């Protein structure tokens, strides 16, 4: 790609993901 | 299109081409994965 930016997409299974690990 | 139904917006032309393609059912990424190939072949065609 050109012109791509950094950034961080969120998971919105992570924190289910998360809290069923604890 | 936007200057034609309403307030002109700004919009990188690279945007613009990635809309159409969408809008003819292809999705955008394959147009920025060969933004530099499809660029040649528009300039050679005008200059055809
Ligand atoms: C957007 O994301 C890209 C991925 O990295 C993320 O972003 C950076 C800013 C960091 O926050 C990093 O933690 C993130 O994960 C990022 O591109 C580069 O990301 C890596 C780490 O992820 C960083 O080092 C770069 O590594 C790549 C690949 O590594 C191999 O090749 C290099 C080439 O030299 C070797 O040095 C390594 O040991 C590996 O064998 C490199 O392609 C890249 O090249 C740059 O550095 C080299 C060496 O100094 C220079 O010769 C080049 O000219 C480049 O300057 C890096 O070495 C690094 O943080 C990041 N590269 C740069 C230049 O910041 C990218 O920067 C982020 N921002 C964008 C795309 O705007
Ligand atoms: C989808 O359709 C398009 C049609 O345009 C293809 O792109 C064209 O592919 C042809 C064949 O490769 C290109 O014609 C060649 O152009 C070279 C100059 O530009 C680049 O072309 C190719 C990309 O296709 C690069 O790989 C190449 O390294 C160049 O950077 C010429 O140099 C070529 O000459 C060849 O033969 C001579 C003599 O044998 C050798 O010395 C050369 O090294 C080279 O091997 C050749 O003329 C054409 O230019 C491309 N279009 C445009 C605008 O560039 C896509 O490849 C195709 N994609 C898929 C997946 O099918
Ligand atoms: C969008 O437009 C801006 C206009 O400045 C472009 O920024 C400029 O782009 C040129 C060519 O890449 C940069 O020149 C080179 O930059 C590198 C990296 O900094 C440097 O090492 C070289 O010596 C040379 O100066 C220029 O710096 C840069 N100017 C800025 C950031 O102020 C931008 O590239 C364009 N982006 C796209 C997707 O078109």
């Known amino acids: 790609v050109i012109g791509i930016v950094n950034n961080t997409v969120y998971d919105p299974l992570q924190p289910e993901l998360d809290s069923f690990k604890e | ?48």
Do not use: C, D, H
């Not at chain 2, 917006?9 to 809309?19: D, G, H, K, R, S």
């Not at chain 2, 990424?29 to 933004?35: I, R, T």
């Open chain 2, 1 to 48: 299109w936007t200057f034609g139904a309403g307030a002109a917006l700004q919009i990188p032309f690279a945007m613009q081409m990635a809309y159409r393609f969408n809008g003819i059912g292809v999705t955008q990424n394959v147009l920025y994965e060969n933004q530099k190939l499809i660029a040649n072949q528009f300039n050679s065609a005008i200059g055809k």
